[model samples]
Target: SHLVKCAEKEKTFCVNGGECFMVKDLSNPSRYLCKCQPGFTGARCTENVPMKVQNQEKAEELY
Candidate 1:
């Protein structure tokens, strides 16, 4: 079984308010995905998304 628990993995794997989600792949190695917050990007959410784009998205959500 290639099952894994995100809680047991590295706590700081994700950055910039990102959440870690475990990926259970039976045919391949198990991995994790980062759910990045607004204004962030990259595999670990370490990159900053353009502020102009981010603000636009936030504005849309306001309504």
Candidate 2:
């Protein structure tokens, strides 16, 4: 149900290849969450930031 709303707005809802997702809340209004790309931030992923700042995990851990 909520996914439909996300899909309809996905194209213009987010920025920089951000993925749109629907979230449910108890008291607050249900809304879409933007899963931004590595270098983006903000509610709609409209803000740009350094990738190093976002990815704090050590690269060696995956190996």
Candidate 3:
């Protein structure tokens, strides 16, 4: 078996604000990938994904 495992280094991109997801490449075990959390995108998870906000409607009478 040519299965090789690697290590994940600490970075600032997926820290503090967003979450980090590590994906191991089955085709290339020597390398790995990162899936950034919400509001983030890019090859290296370095870019931010713009999010859309929605407003709620208020009712005058109580249910």
Q: Which candidate ranks first by TM-score, i.e. highest?
A: 1
Query: Once model 3 is optimally superposed onto the true structure by TM-score, how far is the C-alpha of residue 23 displaced, in angstroms?
Result: 5.7
RMSD over all Cα atoms, model 3 = 7.8
RMSD of each: 5.7, 7.0, 7.8
Off by over 4 Å in 2: 1-5, 24-29, 52-63
Q: What is the lDDT of residue 8 in candidate 3?
A: 41
Q: All candidates' TM-scores? A: 0.55, 0.53, 0.37
> Which is better, 2 or 3, measured by TM-score?
2
Sort by TM-score, best first: what order?
Answer: 1, 2, 3
The residue ranges of model 1 lying beyond 4 angstroms of the native Cα positions read: 1-5, 25-27, 52-63
What C-alpha lDDT values do all the predictions have?
0.67, 0.67, 0.44
How well does candidate 2 match the true structure in TM-score terms?
0.53
Q: Tens-digit lDDT track for model 1 on 1-63?
A: 333445745536778877766676776555777666878877788898775655676576546
Segments of candidate 3 deviating more than 4 angstroms = 1-6, 10-29, 53-63
